[PDB]
From a paper:
Yellow fever virus (YFV) is a re-emerging flavivirus that causes severe hepatic disease and mortality in humans. Crystallographic studies have resolved the structure of the YFV E protein and shown that its domain architecture is similar to related flaviviruses, with three N-terminal ectodomains, known as domains I (DI), II (DII) and III (DIII) and a stem anchor region known as the transmembrane domain (TM). Here we use a chimeric virus platform to resolve the first high resolution cryo-EM structures of YFV. Stark differences in particle morphology and homogeneity are observed between vaccine and virulent strains of YFV, and these are found to have significant implications on antibody recognition and neutralisation.
Exhaustive domain swap interrogation between bYFV17D and bYFVES504 revealed that DIII is a key determinant of virion icosahedral assembly and FLE mAb neutralisation. Similarly, all the chimeric virions in the bYFVES504 backbone retained their parental virus phenotype, except for bYFVES504/DIII17D, which most closely resembles the smooth phenotype of bYFV17D. Next, a cryo-EM map of bYFVES504/DIII17D was resolved to a resolution of 6.5 Å. This reconstruction displays the typical flavivirus architecture of 180 E proteins arranged in a herringbone-like pattern on the virion surface and is substantially better resolved than the bYFVES504 reconstruction. We then utilised the symmetry expanded local reconstruction method to resolve the ASU of bYFVES504/DIII17D to 3.3 Å. Similar to the bYFV17D:2C9 ASU reconstruction, M as well as the transmembrane domains of E have not been resolved. Exchange with DIII of YFV17D allowed for high resolution elucidation of the bYFVES504 virion structure in both unbound and 2C9 (E-DII mAb) bound forms, demonstrating high similarity to bYFV17D. Conversely, there was a significant increase in neutralisation of both bYFVES504/DIII17D and bYFVES504 T380R when compared with the parental bYFVES504.
Numbering used by the authors:
A (entry chain B), B (entry chain C), C (entry chain A): 1 to 391
Write the structure that this text describes.
């Protein structure tokens, strides 16, 4: 079951005869819900997904400024203006200046100068409103049947939760069913946030922070740009003229500020599906309807062999694969004990009742051994498998 | 001597044998200068004026507001925008308004609204930039020839002053010449100020105040009205509509604030001459080129008449008119005394040498009497006129 | 001269027995240098420049990665390796992915990952050396000719200065000579710095600061980027996959850091010719060889008047321009009194003997009346062009 492959693994044990076991899930992590007479259930949060956000704003982070014009008025001869001031994309600025006593000047002091330049956005990030009702939480659930790793990707049941389907049944063929309830409404605070997007790149950002950006922005339906000041500088006026510059691409600064946000991956297939990293959710599992498949079966009592020897795992837990050699739809007895006399089975099975359901069935088994050295033991009689182990 | 009629008058006496006599003149006041053997001279400031100043700004004080347009978007979706936001002559405001299923929304959040309206100035104050080198000055000057009042408007000399005309000559047909050194260009007491104008009314006001004035204003050459929010008001939005209103005419409030300023009149005839009701002049007068007419004339030998009896006038001086019936090309002996049997020339003539030109010519004579009880005497011998006077 | 219009100016004045008057020049300042028996001098600094300085570095701010590839090996199976790890144009990271049966490894544990991408630069910032032996200077000066406004077109002397020489001589026709000695080599601030250049913008940057940029950089005409780390990030490995990204264009952050460095402007008539800013040169000037052209001529004392009447100006002189209608070749006197008697004087002329060479032209002249009220007087005799002034 797929939790073997995840580094952060939590074992959660149900109290005997209890029904509802709570767990908390996070995308780097998985949980193996485990209960005393029922096969263990691996559960993990695969993704949080957001479908069809609405474009609220675009924020420009580089501007190709073009077609500057300037006009000027001599001291106490009036005040200057430009036709471009009547038009919203010209980003104009107005200021006094000194002016030359040789330049038709009347008197010492200040002339007046006005300049305008056609601001156009070269690159912008898009800010999307999160359609909070649309959020899907996608859960993987997989039962410890003892399926070999090749089969995990087909055996995993995938469940999608949103507020319309807060309860779901995972049904496992022959093992019964488990009911999941997940707290989709509580787990995230996307009400006060935008998805922020850049070329091939995306983030989820605080709605205040993204409004408070000192950058020129556009109303998402494509209107005027609204605060040109944050990208256009005018060099303090020369007596005859004033000269204008665009600031550089703020992309490097803007990504620097974004580093604290949760990253988002835009899907490969959908145009407008956004998958969100690091989101988490709480769930409860009704284990009660799960059952062991083969508690009816006879004990294998026949030659067995390891297809993969018991390896360690980071979980302090041993994983092995066993094939029953012949003639037996049967349950494989597994012990781990201090002595080859196997006085007491100190270790705990995670594959709570391992079964070879048919003569070819390659059975994965997971066992949590005691600390210290001990012997894992499989099968019975003259043909036991054994393997020395250490904590 | 038109400064008989002017209400505020200063006499000034030239130092005996000083070629230049100092004087100062004010917008509705007169100096009359006397020197011990020269005919007395009236000098008066007719106007301080500026011809064709440049308009710096127009300031809207009533606006009509038309073609209101609104765009509204539900709280889930993006920022609202209008085409009108790109046009300079639209006053426009952006705000967020409560919405819900009463308005066709999906969600109950704060929707977005923008509303723009076409702004047009109905009436505006014009601000004209003064420039002290452009100030014209005009001086009215007249000798005490003793002409009747009906002749004063032709005998008054008009002297015009500007940056070039730094000194001027007045020539009086029988009485020689004087020249004025009016330092008018520095005598002014205003700077960095606008002539402020409304229909048939005008003012002069501080530049910085008129820039601080909280009203929409326009560059003198035209173009966009650029602080429209000081006349356009938006009533807070209802869920799908916002009501935008122009404020009423501000001219009462505006000229209330102007009430403390010095007044100006646009000329009754000229296109662009503005006359300023203040300022003052400093001057000096070269009197030594004046000569008393006809002192070699014979004395009146025969009967005379008062035709306007001597009267007081507020300057503390006496004015009379006398007709010469016969023997006319003669000087009229004027004496003010206090011992009628043995008269002495105790009082001081302002009409320093009165002469008749032709039979039944009527002269005017102004005389400054001594303190106390006194006689004013005109003519000689038994047919002389005599009049009682006091203080 | 032309320096009247400069935003700020300073006064230095010598006395007889003194010589070698000290001065300081700055690239947009001016000084008036004066001496009692000799014409006043205006001085200013026109350009500091360097021609074709040497390449120090290029610093990249916009990496483009391509052709990434990866090698991965199971735990306890040695170290992964890539040929790209061993050649210059590939950035690489070597690290470990946690792996197990879920990822095709036979054992559970950390297996090594290495990944490399081809690195190319879309843009980079050049750093050029301050080749201080090549630091060109150009120095501007003029004497107080008295010439009217436009003649500044070609009257101004402007002088090349260089590390090749210490001093240069002014030649004034009719006004003698002067020597300016500049210590050109040593005044500069550029102890350890580079010309930093981006496309169409440039800066003078601290050498150590520039070397200490957290950015990939290349020596001269190199073939390798001597650091590559700072623009490449690797998202932590998942199974056998690791994915590599360029950071965004740092240009905006870099210009943000460069803000507050001294500007540079490249010229266009020659490539790689750089005008600096903030240039400095402390100098001394030998005034003793200067002379006045006209001191022996007679005073004008003829029909004369203002053509640009006196005004203040921002550095504290009074400036005026005047005409004699016709007269002799003569000197125009100006004197400043505190009474119209003009026999007692206190103000200073900076044009000491302005020259009316011929009748058809004006002279532009300057004066410094004392604190408080004062009279400017130009001409003498009957042409009493009196013009009052205050502070």
């Amino acid at each position: 079951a797929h939790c073997i492959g995840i580094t952060d693994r939590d074992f959660i044990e149900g109290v005997h005869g209890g029904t509802w076991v709570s767990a908390t899930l996070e995308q780097d992590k998985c949980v193996t819900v485990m209960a005393p007479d029922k096969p263990s259930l691996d559960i993990s949060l695969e993704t949080v997904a957001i479908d069809g956000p609405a474009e609220a704003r675009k924020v420009c982070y580089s501007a190709v400024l073009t077609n500057v014009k300037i006009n000027d008025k001599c001291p106490s001869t009036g005040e200057a203006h430009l036709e471009e001031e009547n038009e919203g994309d010209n980003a104009c600025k107005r200021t006094y200046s000194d002016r030359g006593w040789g330049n038709g000047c009347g008197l010492f002091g200040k002339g007046s100068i006005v300049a305008c330049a056609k601001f156009t956005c070269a690159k912008s990030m898009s800010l999307f409103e999160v359609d909070q009702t649309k959020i899907q939480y996608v859960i993987r659930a997989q039962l410890h049947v003892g399926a070999k790793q090749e089969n995990w990707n087909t055996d995993i049941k995938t469940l999608k939760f949103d507020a319309l389907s807060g309860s779901q049944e995972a049904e496992f063929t022959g093992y019964g069913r488990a009911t999941l309830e997940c707290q989709v409404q509580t787990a995230v605070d996307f009400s006060n946030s935008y998805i922020a997007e850049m070329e091939k790149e995306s983030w989820i950002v605080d709605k205040q922070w993204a409004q408070d950006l000192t950058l020129p922005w556009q109303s998402g339906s494509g209107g005027v740009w609204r605060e040109m000041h944050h990208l256009v500088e005018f060099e303090p006026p020369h007596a005859a003229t004033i000269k204008v510059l665009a600031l550089g691409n703020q992309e490097g600064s803007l990504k620097t500020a974004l580093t604290g946000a949760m990253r988002v991956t835009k899907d490969t297939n959908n145009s407008k599906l956004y998958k969100l990293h690091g989101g988490h959710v709480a769930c409860r599992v009704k284990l009660s309807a799960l059952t062991l498949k083969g508690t009816s079966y006879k004990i294998c009592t026949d030659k067995m062999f390891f297809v993969k020897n018991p390896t360690d795992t980071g979980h302090g837990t041993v994983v092995m694969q066993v094939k029953v050699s012949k003639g037996a739809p049967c349950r494989i007895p597994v012990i781990v004990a201090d002595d080859l006399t196997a006085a007491i089975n100190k270790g705990i099975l995670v594959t709570v009742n391992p079964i070879a359901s048919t003569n070819d069935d390659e059975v994965l088994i997971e066992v949590n051994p005691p600390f210290g050295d001990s012997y894992i033991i499989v099968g019975r009689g003259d043909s036991r498998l054994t393997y020395q182990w250490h904590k």
